[PDB]
Amino acid sequence: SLTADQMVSALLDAEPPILYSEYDPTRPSMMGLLTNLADRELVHMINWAKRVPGFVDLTLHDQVHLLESAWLEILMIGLVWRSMEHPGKLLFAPNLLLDRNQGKEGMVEIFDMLLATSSRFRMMNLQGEEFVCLKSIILLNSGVYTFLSSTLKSLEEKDHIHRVLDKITDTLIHLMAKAGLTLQQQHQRLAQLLLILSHIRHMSNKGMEHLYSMKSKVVPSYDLLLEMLDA
Amino acid sequence: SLTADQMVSALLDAEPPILYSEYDPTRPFSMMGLLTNLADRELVHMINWAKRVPGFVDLTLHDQVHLLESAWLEILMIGLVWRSMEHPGKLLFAPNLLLDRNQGKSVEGMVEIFDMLLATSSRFRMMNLQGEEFVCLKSIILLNSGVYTFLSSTLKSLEEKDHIHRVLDKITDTLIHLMAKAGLTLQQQHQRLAQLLLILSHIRHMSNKGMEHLYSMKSKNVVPSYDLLLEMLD
Ligand SMILES: CN(C)CCOc1ccc([C@H]2C[C@]3(C)[C@@H](O)CC[C@H]3[C@@H]3CCc4cc(O)ccc4[C@@H]32)cc1
Ligand SMILES: CN(C)CCOc1ccc([C@H]2C[C@]3(C)[C@@H](O)CC[C@H]3[C@@H]3CCc4cc(O)ccc4[C@@H]32)cc1
Ligand SMILES: [Mg+2]
């Protein structure tokens, strides 16, 4: 029942904080810093996911499935968003801005992919309001095709998810109309934004490939995610 | 310069044929071998199709190879999902190779992917995806999949990226026009456009999982090389 303006207000209000890397800056490695940062960001991501309109209407199992599918894409879109005003570098945290040379485990290709994404956001002059919409779309869409369930409940859950996704589409279009874009510019920009999400999916897949290769007891389990969502 | 109708006409005409699996149907019924040979032959036709997608051959041959390298398995997959739409619970790899979920388990690499593909065809059916929309989506995959990974900012590459995005914009216009022709409201148009493009993220995911398996095989030419793709495009 939320208006487009109310949807934007809700998403802006739900935004998680920007966290810091944990290292003492007076002291003279990187994977441990990034892993600890991501570990702390995931806790705040669960809080954010619960404030995305329609997300807590789903079952806890479906909430876990969506977050299990989307968490690294959500970390990556956040990283790209905070790196937009840092050409050629990635702002993992305010105290951890790395260039491509510093990027050289698992980042041989991904670093450049992330840089290219932030470059594209810059080319498009992506707005904060648009960004939070995109991030919510990732949460709701990434796992919606892989519930592996044809129960009556699951059919209803998928319908709900797509209704909420439709509302966010309406909201994105509304933001563009507010800005004075023509109808043609509106549907072109909508398409351009959603097509970037495929690239973010690609980057997450490559990132998840590395995390699994580590064989470190480093990918959040279903049961960990379930514990956090119901806490 | 193409109009929306002309863009659709062009894409419909560029459509590759549906190929058959190569096995003797009188012999006892090898699945990965059959599927690989099928895909090998499909890829040859895919290159012909790609060259007929408006705007594609305007690109440098290097950039054409890069786009196809990025997109080819996605394109095979959306093709598969399209020709499986009217076969719930099954995948029509070829007209003489219709596999169900149980048979899917006989296929290495498909423990999760088979169900993912089925879910996509189910979603296409629920949306009543039209042929005109399908060819638009397939062209979008070709142009979009590799456009952020050129790893070049030569003046030429800047121009190539702009061109690609202008063509992508035209296909967006074309999709919206098809929906308007069908009498959808403006709200329904932008909702459906979004629904269609969001499925492309799932298709990328499936391709990445498929590519993971192909690389795991450590089989020469089971992933087409850059030079193989270049030889076919040229
Ligand atoms: C969350 N806990 C439960 C599990 C730890 O997950 C992690 C641990 C480390 C990262 C780092 C390290 C990588 C995966 C590299 O290898 C290849 C891509 C890297 C990503 C990039 C995205 C990203 C964004 C962030 O803002 C913080 C960390 C990271 C990552 C990302 C997620
Ligand atoms: C093209 N030549 C140069 C290289 C061979 O590429 C191949 C070889 C075999 C396939 C098969 C086997 C798989 C990858 C499984 O493993 C996991 C996903 C499978 C995909 C599914 C998509 C697909 C669609 C087709 O219409 C024909 C084959 C296939 C594939 C797909 C592509
Ligand atoms: Mg704008």
Residue numbers in the entry:
A (entry chain A): 309 to 336, 341 to 416, 419 to 531, 533 to 546
B (entry chain B): 309 to 337, 341 to 545
What did the paper state?
We also solved structures with the WT LBD for those molecules with no existing structures (LA-Deg, LA-Stab, RU39411) or were able to solve to improved resolution (RAL). At the 5 μM maximum dose, RU39411, RAL, and BZA showed the greatest reduction in transcription at 0.14 ± 0.02, 0.16 ± 0.02, and 0.17 ± 0.01. Interestingly, RU39411, which significantly enriched ERα levels (SERM-like), showed enhanced transcriptional inhibition compared to most molecules. Overall, these structures present canonical ERα LBD homodimers with 2–4 monomers in the asymmetric unit.
Ligand-dependent transcriptional activities depend on the association of coactivator proteins with ERα to form functional complexes. Activating somatic mutations near ERα helix 12, Y537S and D538G, enable hormone therapy resistance in metastatic ER +breast cancers.
